[PDB]
Design a protein around this ligand. Structure first.
Ligand SMILES: CCNC(=O)[C@H]1O[C@@H](n2cnc3c(NCC(c4ccccc4)c4ccccc4)nc(C(=O)NCCNC(=O)NC4CCN(c5ccccn5)CC4)nc32)[C@H](O)[C@@H]1O
Ligand SMILES: CCCCCCCC/C=C\CCCCCCCC(=O)OC[C@H](O)CO
Length: 444
């Protein structure tokens, strides 16, 4: 079997899978309303980039390898488009990555930051950037300012696209940097996923963390986790009290480190409050650190009068009757009014461990494994090819990778540029379910 014949065959087999698989992803997002959030706007956008990679880029990439005599600029144009379209995937994959970072690590600012308007804008930015970079060769940086006769060359990627372009501008800027950002995103999600738990993380999950001043339920300026600054209607008075509490000019913004110093002051304040209260003091003294955190949690929610309202349930906690206490607390107005928060706090009371709060993280251990898969593929599929280029460009004298290896590298580059949404999308239950619903219907 001819080598070239095996290349064209595998490459078109990829072309089709790309089309079929990614249509599938856009189909799912079209039916299921519950899939029509903003993340999936980035997913579809990649879906689409990848469809054009399958329908256009791959056929042009094949052409580029046959070496027929073409007008240099005609063959430059074909070459450029494959660069544009593969470029679009990479960046579009990166928007997906950055979308996830914000959704997992700064979830209280995600809506008012990645809205539908901005998403569509960011997609414009990706596509415009792809053209800018991929069309650069045509604006002059190319291999034919000065066999086949005059004006024509053998149509092969390396005959029209300069190797210094591909290494210095394209590799370093359009593969290495995107990859490196994706790596940092993965790692930072991972550290969030597997974070150590304590009273600070506990209340962040229940109340949120703000690093910037916001007006509250009833118009009062606040910061961190639940920290009232002033009742005064002035942002300027608010920031002034913030500076006095922190110890520098904030301009209304703090660090996570600093909001922990605040939270701890508020905790000390709740403990002092509890110690003065004769209905709570004994219950608090009898408990262990983690159940103490549960008791303090209720207080931050209801104040101390309210917590002292649970006479029966407080009694049972003092007598160490955990299951009997849990059931008692679950009958309240508190449970019915805010059930998620209460069930987590009641489990904490039942167990003396952080389990209820740990489970809240399993959805981001999920997200981190996904990013890991994407980034690992991405490195696998894009590096051999660009590493091959660098060796050719820096060390032209030295031993070559053999033909089948160099060509496999291209095949790999195009596999990632197609099967990327699908893996991300396949690992989500809501997608996986919709896939099944089409497959056992419109197909059959
Ligand atoms: C977002 C970024 N986008 C991309 O990276 C996309 O752009 C395309 N691309 C990116 N570098 C590409 C690239 N490097 C050129 C590289 C090479 C060649 C073949 C396979 C992989 C890499 C090369 C290395 C060394 C010398 C010249 C080119 N060759 C092609 C592309 O068609 N080659 C196929 C067509 N040529 C050829 O058979 N020449 C032959 C190969 C064997 N000979 C050798 C070998 C060693 C030394 C001298 N002579 C004679 C020339 N395509 C590329 C590819 O589709 C990527 O997905
Ligand atoms: C599995 C992917 C096989 C790659 C096919 C290949 O490398 O073909 C030989 C080479 O193209 C000959 O010039």
């Amino acid at each position: 079997i001819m080598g070239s014949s095996v290349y064209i065959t595998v490459e078109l087999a990829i072309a089709v899978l790309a089309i079929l698989g990614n249509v599938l992803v856009c189909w799912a997002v079209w039916l299921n309303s519950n899939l029509q959030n903003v993340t999936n706007y980035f997913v579809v956008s990649l879906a689409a980039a990848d469809i054009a990679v399958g329908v256009l880029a791959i056929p042009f990439a094949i052409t580029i390898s046959t070496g027929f005599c073409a007008a240099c600029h005609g063959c430059l144009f074909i070459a450029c488009f494959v660069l544009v379209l593969t470029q679009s995937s990479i960046f579009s994959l990166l928007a997906i990555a950055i979308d996830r970072y914000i959704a997992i690590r700064i979830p209280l600012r995600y809506n008012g930051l990645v809205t539908g308007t901005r998403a569509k804008g960011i997609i414009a930015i990706c596509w415009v950037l792809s053209f800018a970079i991929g069309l650069t060769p045509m604006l002059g940086w190319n291999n034919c300012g000065q066999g086949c006769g005059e004006g024509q060359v053998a149509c092969l990627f390396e005959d029209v696209v300069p190797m210094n372009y591909m290494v210095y501008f394209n590799f370093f800027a359009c593969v290495l940097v995107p990859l490196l950002l994706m790596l940092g995103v993965y790692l930072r999600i991972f550290l969030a996923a597997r974070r150590q738990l304590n009273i600070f993380e506990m209340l962040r999950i229940d109340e949120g963390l703000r690093l910037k001043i916001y007006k509250d339920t009833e118009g009062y300026y606040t910061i961190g986790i639940g920290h009232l600054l002033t009742k005064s209607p002035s942002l300027n008075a608010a920031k002034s009290e913030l500076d006095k509490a922190i110890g520098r000019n904030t301009n209304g913004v703090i660090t996570k480190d600093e909001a922990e110093k605040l939270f701890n002051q508020d905790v000390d304040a709740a403990v002092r409050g509890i110690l003065r209260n004769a209905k709570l003091k004994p219950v608090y003294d009898s408990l262990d650190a983690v159940r103490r955190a549960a008791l303090i949690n209720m207080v931050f929610q209801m104040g101390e009068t309210g917590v002292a309202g649970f006479t029966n349930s407080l009694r049972m906690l003092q007598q160490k009757r955990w299951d009997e206490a849990a059931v008692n607390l679950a009958k309240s107005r508190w449970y019915n009014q805010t059930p998620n928060r209460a069930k987590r706090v009641i489990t904490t009371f039942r167990t003396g461990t952080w389990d209820a709060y740990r489970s809240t993280l399993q959805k981001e251990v999920h997200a981190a494994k996904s990013l890991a898969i994407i980034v690992g593929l991405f490195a696998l599929c894009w590096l051999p090819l660009h590493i091959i280029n660098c060796f050719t460009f820096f060390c032209p004298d030295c031993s070559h990778a053999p033909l089948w290896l160099m060509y496999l590298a291209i095949v790999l580059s195009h596999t990632n540029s197609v099967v990327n949404p699908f893996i991300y999308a396949y690992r989500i239950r809501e997608f996986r379910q919709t896939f099944r619903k089409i497959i056992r219907s419109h197909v059959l």
